[model samples]
Target: KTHVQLSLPVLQVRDVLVRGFGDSVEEVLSEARQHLKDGTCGLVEVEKGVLPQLEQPYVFIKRSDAAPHGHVMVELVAELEGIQYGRSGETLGVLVPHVGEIPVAYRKVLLRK
Candidate 1:
């Protein structure tokens, strides 16, 4: 139902402490990793937030083993204009910067699931 786009390449976030938006970050990252296994493209732009303290903010792209053929690993779901993490308004996804959150496609997803 949604689309996630990859604007750059892919890279390893090695040992970096990535905090999930709440609980979904783990599932998000996990599903994302599976998407990357196909030798994908797109880079990661990671930054430390003011409210959240990350060691550093950096962008990473996925590298390729072969030449001229790589999958766009990074995908974007959709950028919300004014949506909270949940209906109860407990958490906020707006904490992340509004730079370039790639858009991901949902065609691969099974409707039954």
Candidate 2:
């Protein structure tokens, strides 16, 4: 059996469902295409990124079906390659409402829809 791994960055997070913004998947693809055309997103290094940065420092929320501990505040940390947001020694994190807690990795990207 061949399972296709369709991983992608999450563009928007509403409740528990993380989906790309737009009317439909086609729109999402269209927007992403524009990013490629304008040299915003890339095929090589990260030209543009939107990693999640929770407001409060905590741990990672384990388990896919878990709810947010509380008011989850996520910020978009996007920038061109070599122009990453945040400064040296900066810290960030996320939390699972009723699950495990782990330090938020810099690449805690909202997986693609």
Candidate 3:
């Protein structure tokens, strides 16, 4: 069936690893929701974007219960300057602005399937 009437490898993005990047975002959102001033939602300083419509994009971001696995989610993955400047041996990890002492360790993912 030629059902791909629209567009986009990222042919696929897998997070089969336990407590990897996918898990990181889940936990982060949980903490952000937990730290909400009220009703489990709060605003955040969404970094490095220019949106005229969202003047003050404050949100107690949430993870929807269900969604198209093929569709993308709203999240940010930053490559540090050290990496940009050719520093790969140091380390790699995830962070959540809403909480402190959040740590995640990952393995060297090699080869493309």
TM-score per prediction, in order, is 0.22, 0.21, 0.19
User: Which runs in model 1 stand beyond 4 Å of their true positions?
Assistant: 1-23, 47-113
List the candidate numbers ranked by lDDT, top first: 1, 2, 3
lDDT of 1 by residue, 42-88 (tens): 23234454223322121112221222122322222312223322222
- What tens-digit string does per-residue lDDT give for candidate 3 at 1-113? 21111111000012211212122334543443333322222122223331122211112222222324343122222232222211123221232232222223222211110
Q: Tell me the RMSD of model 3 versus the true structure.
A: 17.0
What pairs collide in candidate 3? 42-60, 43-59
Q: Which pairs in model 2 have colliding backbones?
A: 8-111, 8-112, 9-112, 10-110, 10-111, 59-102, 60-102, 69-97
Better of 1 and 3 by lDDT: 1
- lDDT string, candidate 2, 1-113, tens digits: 11111112222222313222233334434554344233332111111232342211212211222213332222222223234332222222221121122212222322222
- How does model 3 score by TM-score? 0.19
Each prediction's number of clashing residue pairs: 28, 8, 2
